[PDB]
């Protein structure tokens, strides 16, 4: 009775969150404890949580635009059923949830240097560098990577914020059909592409690493960008 | 289409690009020409964070610039004046957008690896010279004074932009609307100007700021707002 | 005019002035009077950030206080009604101050006084030949209350978003009541748990009383605890 149209989008997101949580806890806490016993139990409140929000956000963003890709293909290559109609109707809720989780992820990410662990690690690093008579700690490519993906993520968040602001009913009922369609489609595709590029750039050289497979399991950033890449590739194919 | 957004956006382009090529001329090309140094990693963030504040503060000054002209000509209407006065809402919305972007960019400085490497190098250099205290007095005051002013100005801008939602704006009696749209905007512009002025502590008298013959950007940024504020003060008093 | 926005602003101003005077007396005057130390640079940020969280949490507790009293007496006078017609303004002011407090709190590691302290600590650690500087419970505390505060701020943001007049007309009575009551109570509980966790072991510390006065976090969590306790009692007698 309460929020009938919000039942499905909330039922799908939560499960994903669970399927992420027990994954991360299995790769950064249980594994270091099983071999070379070390208790990394202080990473649950922030470090583990921050690996769940972006995945949910990007998955919901991809699910927003998948139904249109399916519909165009079914129209061209050989009415719609009930499931297709529900997918076409739940897009607004999917997008709003994606924006909410993206804002939460950005707020979590902006507060890394505040914690005391960073200060302790910095002091230990300084002491170790002093004790080894090393003058320069500068590294170029890592700095380049950091700057690039930080800027890309900020721009993507700004685009998502604009496209979420334009969804107020009083604001929405003030624009013609063409402008509303343009804003809802082009800006959303651009934001999805920017988020995908940000996630791709975040992983600099871990693609060729073998250590990233903790036991036999691929890392998280490989699964995070599997669906957006497919959506963008199909959109490009239908574009030409 | 957006017919009413055609003019301001174009302006936002001309202010932006002209700034970029300016900053790149003073922070990258000049160190490369003399005392060869790469300095090519500042473009993604450091160079961009010098373009957003200037566009945000230049568009805010253009909102209240037709206001002072209208009073003067009345004491002493063309189509261009009306065209200018019918785009103040768009100018203010763009200014708020760019101010939010600038604040978000500025809040993310300490989380980069360059800061960590610089901190480690500074600690190593301080250890290698036997200096117990690196504390300084005036810089702490300098950097703790203007951050709060910038935050307050951003809060005032956010409130005045929230006031501009069409559903919200029909619940006012136009007196509260006029008060919020005028007084709060003037206070926000003054706060931003003071924040920018306090940012430059003693670089006004420094001679190394002029690389070849060009003045720094904080002198150009606060030119028009000072004139606007002086004219408003003259008119009020 | 804003005839309905007078009493909340007066209450907020009184609370802010009292908290500012109390914090300035506790954190500045006492170190100056005995064992003379300047400590005058803490006013712009470190003192202002001890006032906003108290105003935000005190106004949020006053939203649900009239509801508790009405249930107690039932099991309306003029004062009760005039209190009940200001809850929306109280909540909006509380949200504004909470956002401000979060934004000031997010910008601590950027200032130079942190960098100088870090360099001094590194030099001191090198001088004392100390290899490991790890402490566990401090890290646990930091992570826990930072996460709790962020979650509480998110819930407050959603509750304040729900208050747009054009958005509240598309929600029936049941959904509006649910959102405005349950989520707000959960947010108040999260905020008070955040405040409680912030004070790890200062509850059993003697030097927290400057002369005889309890610290700020003791006063800040008096009303919310009473409100939550009475809600719990009224839920299960």
């Amino acid at each position: 009775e309460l929020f009938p149209q919000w039942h499905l989008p909330i039922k799908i997101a939560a499960i994903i969150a669970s399927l992420t949580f027990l994954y991360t806890l299995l790769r950064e806490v249980i594994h270091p404890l099983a071999t070379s016993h070390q208790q990394y139990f202080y990473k649950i409140p922030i470090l583990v949580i921050n690996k769940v929000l972006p995945m949910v956000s990007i998955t919901l963003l991809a699910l927003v635009y998948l139904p249109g890709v399916i519909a165009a293909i079914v129209q061209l290559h050989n009415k719609f059923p009930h499931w297709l109609d529900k997918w076409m109707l739940t897009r607004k809720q999917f997008g709003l949830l994606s924006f909410f989780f993206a804002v939460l992820h950005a707020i979590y990410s902006l507060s890394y240097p505040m914690r005391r662990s960073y200060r302790y690690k910095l002091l230990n690093w300084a002491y170790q560098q002093v004790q080894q008579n090393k003058e320069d700690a500068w590294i170029e490519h890592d700095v380049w990577r950091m700057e690039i993906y930080v800027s890309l993520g900020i721009v993507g968040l700004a685009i998502l914020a604009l496209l979420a602001v334009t969804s107020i009913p009083s604001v929405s009922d003030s624009l013609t059909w063409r402008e509303f369609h343009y804003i809802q489609s082009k800006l959303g595709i651009v934001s999805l592409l920017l988020g995908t590029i940000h996630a791709l750039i975040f992983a600099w050289n871990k693609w060729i690493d073998i250590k990233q497979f903790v036991w036999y399991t691929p890392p998280t950033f490989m699964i995070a960008v599997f669906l957006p890449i497919v959506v963008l590739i199909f959109k490009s194919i239908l574009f030409l | 289409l957006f017919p009413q957004w055609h003019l301001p956006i174009k302006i936002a382009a001309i202010i932006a690009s002209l700034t970029f090529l300016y900053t790149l001329l003073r922070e990258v090309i000049h160190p490369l020409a003399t005392s060869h140094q790469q300095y090519f990693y500042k473009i993604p963030i450091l160079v961009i964070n010098k373009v957003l504040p200037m566009v945000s503060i230049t568009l805010l000054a253009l909102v209240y610039l037709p206001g002072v002209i209208a009073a003067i000509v009345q004491l002493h209407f063309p189509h261009w004046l009306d065209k200018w006065m019918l785009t103040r809402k768009q100018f203010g919305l763009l200014s708020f957008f760019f101010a939010v972007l600038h604040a978000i960019y500025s809040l993310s400085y300490p989380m980069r690896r360059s800061y960590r490497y610089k901190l480690l190098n500074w600690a190593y250099q301080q250890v290698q010279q036997n200096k117990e205290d690196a504390w300084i007095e005036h810089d702490v005051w300098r950097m703790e004074i203007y951050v709060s002013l910038g935050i307050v100005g951003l809060a005032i801008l956010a409130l005045l932009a929230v006031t501009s939602i069409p559903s919200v704006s029909d619940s006012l009696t136009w007196r509260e609307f006029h008060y919020i749209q005028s007084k709060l905007g003037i206070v926000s512009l003054l706060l931003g100007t003071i924040h920018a002025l306090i940012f430059a502590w003693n670089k006004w008298i420094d001679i190394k700021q002029f690389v070849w013959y060009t003045p720094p950007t904080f002198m150009i940024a606060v030119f028009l707002p000072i004139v606007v504020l002086i004219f408003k003060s003259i008119l009020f008093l | 005019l804003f005839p309905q926005w007078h009493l909340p602003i007066k209450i907020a101003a009184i609370i802010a002035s009292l908290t500012f005077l109390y914090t300035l007396l506790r954190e500045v005057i006492h170190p100056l009077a005995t064992s003379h130390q300047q400590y005058f640079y803490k006013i712009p940020i470190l003192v202002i950030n001890k006032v906003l969280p108290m105003v935000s949490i005190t106004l949020l507790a006053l939203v649900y206080l009239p509801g508790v009293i009405a249930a107690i007496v039932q099991l309306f006078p003029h004062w009760l009604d005039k209190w009940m017609l200001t809850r929306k303004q109280f909540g909006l002011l509380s949200f504004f101050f909470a956002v401000l407090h979060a934004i000031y709190s997010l910008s601590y590691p950027m200032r130079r006084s942190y960098r100088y302290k870090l360099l001094n600590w590194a030099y001191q650690q090198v001088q004392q030949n100390k290899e490991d500087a790890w402490i566990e419970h401090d890290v646990w505390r930091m992570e826990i209350y930072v996460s709790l505060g962020i979650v509480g701020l998110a819930i407050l943001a959603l509750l304040a978003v729900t208050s747009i007049p054009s958005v509240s007309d598309s929600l029936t009575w049941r959904e509006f009541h649910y959102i405005q009551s349950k989520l707000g109570i959960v947010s108040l509980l999260l905020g008070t748990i955040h405040a409680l966790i912030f004070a790890w072991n200062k509850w059993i510390d003697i030097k927290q009383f400057v002369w005889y006065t309890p610290p700020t976090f003791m006063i800040a969590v008096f009303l919310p605890i009473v409100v939550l306790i009475f809600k719990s009692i009224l839920f299960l007698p």
Epitope: V130, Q131, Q132, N133 | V127, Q128, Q129, N130, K131, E132, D133 | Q124, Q127
Partner: antibody
Framework: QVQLVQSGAEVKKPGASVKVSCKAS????????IEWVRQAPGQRLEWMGE????????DFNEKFQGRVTFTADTSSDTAYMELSSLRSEDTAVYYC??????????????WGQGTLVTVS | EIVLTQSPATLSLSPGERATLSCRAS?????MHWFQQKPGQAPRLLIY???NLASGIPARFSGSGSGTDYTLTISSLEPEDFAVYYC?????????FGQGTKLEI
Amino acid sequence: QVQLVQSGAEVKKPGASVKVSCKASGYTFSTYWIEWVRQAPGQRLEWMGEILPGSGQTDFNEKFQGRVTFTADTSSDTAYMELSSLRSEDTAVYYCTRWGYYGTRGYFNVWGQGTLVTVS
Amino acid sequence: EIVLTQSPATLSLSPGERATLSCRASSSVSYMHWFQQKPGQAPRLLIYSTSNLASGIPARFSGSGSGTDYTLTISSLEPEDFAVYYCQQRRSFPYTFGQGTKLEI
């Protein structure tokens, strides 16, 4: 092996100016600070100033601010001190000094042989 | 600036007893450095951080203290430790030296 070599003894008259040189060999001259210290007969050691070769950053004593100056030449790896308006109390010995640290070993301090300046 | 004062003016002490020198300060100073000087030579670093011996320095010399009370202790006086001793602080910008403490027979 780091070493610092200074010039020879100098004799002057009041109202003239004096120049003293310190050449450092054994490390990168344009990275570490060089301090200039003075000792007078029957008096405590006096810390005059500090310079950073290779960049513009020079620290003075309040008393000597306005009479003494420090210059650096990186090509020849030399630091020069110039003092003006010599009085009868400016006869002393001047040293150029440098600190350093080595991991797991500790601090070390290196001094010059000293340049004697007399006035009469 | 910070002024450093050394209490004993001179020590006409037997060749083989123990010696105790003090370098009292006038302001809060974390660490203190001790140098020695012989006629015709530049000062030589002896002790840094009030508890660390320089490379090659024998074990006779020792240092202690905190706050503003710093003490240099000599256990045995071999016929080589007859010189002048100075104390230096490196907290304030003007690095002030001590006045010296001649030790004789």
